[PDB]
Amino acid sequence: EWEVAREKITMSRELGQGSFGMVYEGVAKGVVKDEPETRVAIKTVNEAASMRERIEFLNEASVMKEFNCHHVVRLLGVVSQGQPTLVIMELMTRGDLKSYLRSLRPPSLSKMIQMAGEIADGMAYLNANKFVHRDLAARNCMVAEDFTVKIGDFGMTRDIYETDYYRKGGKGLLPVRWMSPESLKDGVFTTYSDVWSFGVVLWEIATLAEQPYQGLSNEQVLRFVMEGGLLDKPDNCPDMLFELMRMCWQYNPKMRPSFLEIISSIKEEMEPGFREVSFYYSEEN
Numbered sequence: 001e002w003e004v005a006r007e008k009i010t011m012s013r014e015l016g017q018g019s020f021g022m023v024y025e026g027v028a029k030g031v032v033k034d035e036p037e038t039r040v041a042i043k044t045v046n047e048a049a050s051m052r053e054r055i056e057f058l059n060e061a062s063v064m065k066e067f068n069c070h071h072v073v074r075l076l077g078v079v080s081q082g083q084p085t086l087v088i089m090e091l092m093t094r095g096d097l098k099s100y101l102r103s104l105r106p107p108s109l110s111k112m113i114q115m116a117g118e119i120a121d122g123m124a125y126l127n128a129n130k131f132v133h134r135d136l137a138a139r140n141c142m143v144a145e146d147f148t149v150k151i152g153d154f155g156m157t158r159d160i161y162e163t164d165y166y167r168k169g170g171k172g173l174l175p176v177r178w179m180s181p182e183s184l185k186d187g188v189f190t191t192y193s194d195v196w197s198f199g200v201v202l203w204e205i206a207t208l209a210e211q212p213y214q215g216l217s218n219e220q221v222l223r224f225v226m227e228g229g230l231l232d233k234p235d236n237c238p239d240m241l242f243e244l245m246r247m248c249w250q251y252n253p254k255m256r257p258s259f260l261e262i263i264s265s266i267k268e269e270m271e272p273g274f275r276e277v278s279f280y281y282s283e284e285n
């Protein structure tokens, strides 16, 4: 019942290539409440794909059928009939948060706190649903037309950010520069490690997306972040942000704040709209 007739979907220009195939920018006609057409992002599957990739695709989308938070890119619909298979989702005109930020290269705080607070509301919602994003960083956060930041389209894939990952012991691609020291060590991902990445996302927002630990190598990151090293407070960083940052980089994961606690601490520095849309104020919470 998330099924949509191809008739209702247009497609208007390629955005780029996604893990499972080309992802387009388009329009849908029967996908929102009281809204004729709606700008949407269309995700197709390569024609070469194995019958197993068409079942990974269709399953990654079956995952979001359980989500519904204003701060996590939404799944508007699937076209599971005919071909090319289509997954339809809320369009984020401004794109990924890392690019956006790299764009602004010469934010207030009202603006930096609004980003942080939406991302955190997204996470709080996810963790609340027993979900643990395991690759939370600017690049996997998208920015909407109205500048809202959302935890969108899970992971995405490859792209211009290959340097963002490394294969600790040649065992596959991991975002080490965003990973908690306990993860680096043991390799396990938790909501606490999610909070660790959150503070790196915050650090990204203050440095307009610089590369975490730039003067270091990936092999050097691992040593440094595992031994109790942290990032420096950036040039003109608001004493508040950085304070929130190292609340997140507490070595012991249990001494770290939760995402809800993080919102609660900035609950009143955020635009008036938050309260009526967020998860934090939702009865769900």
Ligand SMILES: COc1cc(Nc2nccc(Nc3cnc4ccccc4c3)n2)ccc1N1CCOCC1
Pocket: 015, 016, 017, 018, 019, 023, 041, 073, 089, 090, 091, 092, 093, 094, 095, 096, 099, 142, 152, 153, 156, 157, 159
């Ligand atoms: C991050 O990229 C963008 C996202 C959106 N919005 C959006 N909303 C909702 C879902 C979504 N899904 C995906 C998923 N995987 C992709 C993999 C590769 C490329 C696009 C992808 C889009 N995307 C709009 C423009 C851009 N861009 C950024 C860079 O090139 C210029 C265009």
